[PDB]
A paper describes a structure:
Signaling occurs when the mature domain, structurally reminiscent of two clasped hands complete with four β-strand “fingers” and a “wrist” helix for each monomer, combines two type 1 and two type 2 serine-threonine kinase receptors on the cell surface leading to intracellular cross-phosphorylation of the type 1 receptors and subsequent phosphorylation of specific SMAD transcription factors. For example, BMP2 can signal through the type 1 receptors Alk3 and Alk6 but maintains a higher affinity for Alk3. Growth and Differentiation Factor 5 (GDF5), on the other hand, strongly prefers signaling through Alk6 as compared to Alk3, leading to differences in signaling outcomes.
Using this protein, we were able to readily solve the X-ray crystal structure of BMP2/GDF5 to a resolution of 2.8 Å. As expected, the BMP2/GDF5 heterodimer displays the characteristic shape of a BMP growth factor, however, the dimer clearly displays an asymmetrical appearance. Compared to the apo-BMP structure, the BMP2 half of the heterodimer displays much less curvature in the β-strands that form the “fingers” of the BMP fold. In contrast, the GDF5 half exhibits slightly increased curvature of the β-strands compared to apo-GDF5. Thus, the fingers of the heterodimer can be described as opening on the BMP2 side and closing on the GDF5 side. This overall difference in curvature in the fingers across the dimer is responsible for the asymmetrical shape of the growth factor. The BMP2/GDF5 heterodimer possesses two unique type 1 receptor binding sites, BFGW with this inhibitory Arg located in the wrist helix and GFBW with the more permissive Ala. Indeed, superposition of both Alk3 and Alk6 into this site shows that R438 would sterically clash with Alk3, much like in homodimeric GDF5. Thus, while the BFGW site maintains the discriminatory R438 residue of GDF5, the overall shape of the pocket is more open, which might allow the receptors to position themselves slightly differently than that observed for the homodimers.
Residue numbers in the entry:
A (entry chain A): 11 to 114
B (entry chain B): 16 to 120
Write the structure that this text describes.
Amino acid sequence: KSSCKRHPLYVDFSDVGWNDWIVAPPGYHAFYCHGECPFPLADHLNSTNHAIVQTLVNSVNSKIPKACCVPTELSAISMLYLDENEKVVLKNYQDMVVEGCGCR
Amino acid sequence: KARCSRKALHVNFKDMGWDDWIIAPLEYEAFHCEGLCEFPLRSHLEPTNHAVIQTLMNSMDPESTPPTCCVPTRLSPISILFIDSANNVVYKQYEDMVVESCGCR
């Protein structure tokens, strides 16, 4: 199934120029969501009343797009950086890692 | 602009066959979200931190990582008057039926 699934995505901090700020970690798995939403009433696709209706309109009218596959649960991740006094400090960043996908 | 925006969408319950349970309304405006998610990202479309990162990664290498989707970010309800599985008449509020704003996710 090429349907709505989570997909691997690793963001390396060397490759974007951030590793002289973020002493740790060196990267993290964010993942992304992609795939078709033909039947958003599938219990595993968390869906909205709106996505279901719209997907229904799509089957009769191709000019209305189907619902889009997007993250529906995101978790935080922590990094370590240097203080103004060069003290190691942790900082949490919300909504960074896909935990579940769905149709919206 | 082909940028993520809100568009009209007329929902006709008679065309789906739900005349049978539904009494009123038999048609309503639901809207939908269509458009490009790319830099620059308007901040009043409150994009999630994850969506920013995905847009960045798609900006760097559009193979292997795709852009975010234009989808609803606030919805409102309508109330429907219809006939129960038990054959009663009821008036229930259905959540997330009308798009109020779009965004990138």
